[PDB]
C-alpha cells in the first residue's frame, strides 16, 4: 500500500497535518516520528489516490500552523522498507 | 472534544502558557511534549469555546516569559489523531 | 506554594543558578529539566517572597557563568500544573 | 561485504533514499541511524557493484525529497567496524 | 567539598579537560554530563585549591582540542545542590 | 594504553574514520559516542605510535566523506578517565 509523509519543524504543525490527512482521505495514521532538531514526520498508509490527496491537504493545513519541511508519497514502498516503518507502534 | 496547543522554545515559557491556560478557561491539561531543539508543546482538552480562550491566554502569557512558536486549536480532532495524543500520560 | 524558574543555555550556568538560589532564600530545589538544545531549567518551590529573591540571585549569578535565557516566578501555580512538575524526582 | 551509506537531514528524504536503494540494486537494508540534529543515515549491505549503484540511486532520489548530507561506500569494512553496525537491529 | 566544572562543545575537548584536570591536581572525577546541542560538562570534587588548579588546567588543555564554553568553581555547593550532581554515577 | 579520538559531524564521516583507523594501524576500536547535535566521536586504544598513525589516517579519510571537528591523542589517559570511556560497551 502507498506511503505518505509530511515533515514539519514543530509538533503543533505536525498534529495539524495529521488531522487534516485522515479527515481528507481514507488513509490510516501510522503515527509520527521525531529525529530531533524539532523535525517531526507524520506517516499514513492507504491507496495511492487516497494518500496523495491526504498529503496535499496535510501540507496545506500545516503551513498555516507552522513550518513544513518535506512532503512525499511512495505508491509502493519496497517490502524491506516496511520493517523500518511502524504499523502504529 | 477540542484540542489546544501552545508551542514554545524553552520550558519556562511553556510552564507559563500551561498555568495561564488552565486558569483562564475550563480546559484539562494533558501535559507537554518536547521534540528536541528546545521545542515544547503544551496540550489541553475541553469545549471549543474554553480551549480557544485558554490558548489565547496561554500564548499571551508565554510571549512575556519566552519565545512562542505555534498556537493552534482543533475543535474536533479525528479519532485516529487521538491515539497519538496523551491522556495525561 | 510559589514556583521559581531559571533557564540557561549550558549546565554549568544552571548549577550556579541552583546553588545561588538555595543559598539566597528559603526555597527547596526541585531539580533541573533539560529540553535539549542545551536548555536547562532549574526549579524551586517556596513562599513567593523567598522564590522571588532566589530567582533574582540565581539569574544574576548565572549570567556571570553562562547564558541565561528565561527567569520567571509563579506565586501560585494551578493544581493541574503541579503534576507536570517534579517533586524532586 | 560492501557497506553503503546515505545521510540526510530529515526522515522523509531518508525513507526515499532507502526505498530507491533496495529497488535499484540487490542490497539488503540494515536500517537507519539517527545521531540527532535531524541527521539520518541509511545503511545497506551487498556486493560492491550492487551497493555502488544503490547509493547513487539513493542520493539522487533523496535530493528530490530533501537534503542529502553524505554518501559513501566501503567495499570491505574492517571486521571490528562490523560490531558498531547493526545487522538490522 | 569544592565543585569544578568545565563545559565544552564536543566530547573530545571534554575528555582532554578531564584528563588534564585529574593529572593537574588532587580532584576526583565525578564524570561528564551532556545536555544535548553537543554540550558536555566535566565535573570534579576536591579541596578548593585543588579544584581551582584543575579547572584552570582543564580549560587550557581543552581550548587546544576544541571549544570551551564555561568554566566555574563552587568552593562549597549547598547540600541540596549535591543531590542533582552525580557521585560518579 | 594510548587513547585516540576522531570527532565528526555526521555518522557517515565517523564510520569512514573508524574503518580507516583500524585498517591503518594496530588499534582496537572501542566504539563511537554521540553527544547530539550530530557530533560523533570514534574511540580507539593501542600503543601511542599506533594510535597516532590511526588518528591521522582517520581524520584524513573522514574529511573526504564529511565534516571533521576534532582529532586528539592521549598517550596515557589518567586511570580515573578510563571509567568514563567504554571498553567497547
Swiss-Prot record, chains A, B, C, D, E, F:
Artificial BMCs can be made in E.coli by expressing pduA-pduB/B'-pduT-pduU-pduN-pduJ-pduK (in this order). Enzymes can be targeted to the BMC, and appear to be encapsulated within it. PROSITE patterns: BMC_1, BMC_2. PANTHER family: BACTERIAL MICROCOMPARTMENT SHELL PROTEIN PDUJ, PROPANEDIOL UTILIZATION PROTEIN PDUA. Changing residue 78 to A: Decreased amounts of PduP in purified BMCs. One of the major shell proteins of the bacterial microcompartment (BMC) dedicated to 1,2-propanediol (1,2-PD) degradation. At least one of PduA or PduJ is required for BMC assembly; it must be encoded as the first gene in the pdu operon. Not required for structural integrity of BMCs, it is required to mitigate propionaldehyde toxicity. Controls diffusion of 1,2-PD into and propionaldehyde out of the BMC shell; residue 40 is particularly important for pore permeability. Homohexamer with a central pore of about 5.6 Angstroms in diameter. The hexamers pack against each other in arrays. Interacts with the N-terminus of PduP which targets PduP to the BMC. Modeling suggests PduC, PduD, PduE, PduL and PduP interact with a cleft formed by the C-terminal segments of 2 adjacent PduA subunits (on the BMC luminal side) in the hexamer. Changing residue 34 to Q: Improved growth on 1,2-PD, makes slightly larger BMCs, alters accumulation of PD metabolites. SUPFAM superfamilies: CcmK-like. Disruption phenotype: Cells do not make BMCs, diol dehydratase is found in diffuse aggregates near the cell pole; it was later found this a double pduA-pduBB' deletion. A single deletion forms larger than normal BMCs; it is not fully complemented by protein produced from a plasmid. Grows in an interrupted manner on 1,2-PD and vitamin B12; grows for a while then stops, then restarts as toxic propionaldehyde accumulates and then decreases. Increased DNA mutagenesis, showing propionaldehyde is a mutagen. Gene3D superfamilies: 3.30.70.1710. This is Bacterial microcompartment shell protein PduA. Keywords: Bacterial microcompartment, Transport. One of its GO terms (biological process) is propanediol catabolic process. Residues 2-86 form the BMC domain. Changing residue 52 to A: Slow growth at limiting vitamin B12, wild-type at saturating conditions. The lineage of its organism: Bacteria, Pseudomonadati, Pseudomonadota, Gammaproteobacteria, Enterobacterales. The C-terminal 14 residues mediate binding to the N-terminus of PduP, which encapsulates PduP into BMCs.
